[PDB]
């Protein structure tokens, strides 16, 4: 939802007007992934949804990898707070 | 003795049956091109259609019908004449239906 998205942005933004940071982006993606993993738990045979998921995960991973090479501190902070390995 | 009823015309390429029923689908009367003594080409024609249509219609007017809902099946040339024949017999036609699959 948009209200959730609005919480997440405020929780994870690196300044006031920031929505374009990886922290933000990954946060949002992380939520969408968790919601959709839940969707697929019930609707296992929803293949076309699963394809969407796989791309989301990918988008995550590329942002994390991006973060990791830019700033390792930020990378650690972010994976801890979200709960990723 | 009933007033309102359905007339299920079956005009095929070979024959024209005409049943007339009540609203519950119980047969009041019927006639057909074959029961009209037409044979072969003649059973297909719209002449035999009107014959059967009126033969069963006049049978229905004895039981005291007035208004007919019509339903048509089959691709035959008889429906056109047969339906006019239900109006020409005296019985007023309301809803037409073509239930042809």
């Amino acid at each position: 939802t948009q209200e959730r998205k609005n919480q997440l942005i405020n929780e994870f933004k690196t300044h006031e007007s920031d929505t374009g940071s990886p922290e933000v982006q990954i946060a949002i993606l992380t939520d969408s992934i968790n919601n959709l993993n839940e969707h697929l738990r019930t609707h296992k045979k929803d293949h076309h949804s699963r394809r969407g998921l796989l791309k989301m995960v990918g988008k995550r991973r590329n942002l994390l990898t991006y973060l990791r090479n830019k700033d390792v501190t930020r990378y650690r902070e972010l994976i801890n707070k979200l709960g990723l390995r | 003795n009933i007033e309102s009823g359905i007339a299920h015309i079956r005009s095929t390429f070979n024959n024209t049956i005409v049943t007339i029923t009540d609203t519950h689908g119980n047969a009041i009367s019927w006639s057909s091109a074959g029961a009209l003594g037409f044979r072969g080409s003649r059973k297909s024609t719209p002449f035999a259609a009107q014959m059967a249509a009126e033969t069963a219609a006049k049978g229905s007017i004895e039981h005291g019908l007035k208004t007919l809902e019509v339903t048509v099946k089959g691709p035959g040339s008889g429906r056109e004449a047969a339906i006019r024949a239900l109006q020409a017999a005296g019985l007023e036609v309301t809803a037409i239906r073509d239930v042809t699959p």
Binding site: - | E80, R84, Q87, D98
Partner: protein, 264 residues
Amino acid sequence: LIEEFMLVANETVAEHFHWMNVPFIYRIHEEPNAEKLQKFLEFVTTFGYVVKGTAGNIHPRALQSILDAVRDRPEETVISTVMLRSMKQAKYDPQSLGHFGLSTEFYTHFTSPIRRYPDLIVHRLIRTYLINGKVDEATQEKWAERLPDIAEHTSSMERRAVDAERETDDLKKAEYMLDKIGEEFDGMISSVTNFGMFVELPNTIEGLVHVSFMTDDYYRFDEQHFAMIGERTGNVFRIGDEITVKVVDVNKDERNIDFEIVGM
């Protein structure tokens, strides 16, 4: 506006002289031909309509109720055209037989005596009966003897006139289009005879399209469903369909215009 006034004037004059019960000329329109109308009532059942009337005794209102229903539909030009083919002509007559198309029992022509002889007669009958007060038996017997021959003659002269006016229209219509060769137009299928197809351009100009110019397929006329049915390609050309056409042969002398199937 002017139509309605002339109508009510004409009805009022006709009504007055009906109740006067003197010999008078009327403008009658009989009930439509019961055989042609029978085919029309069948034809409008193809579309699922029901007309509250018989082919012997149909009320004008019933035929208007179809014309209103079909307004803005694919069954508009088709029905209307087959309704005309079941209509008759109007004529003058000494008997008050009514005017089917105007749905009134009392009609005459009073309002154009410069250009119609039955209007000049009505004027004389008005001057005879109302102004001069001459409603004696000898005056009635004289007019009763003269009116049938005048009515039958004038009705024949009207039909001759209209046929001639149309003939000259169709003639100069070709004359207009002796330079339309090739030029494509978007004009509706106005009629479907077995010997071809007839396409009215928006400006009321019709032309022919035989199977000679139906080059793609061997089409066939379905009378019941007023249409052209092709089989080799599986085509359908009903009446009233908006289509394109090209002027090929405007032969003015016989008053021919020809089209070809550019498409639909």
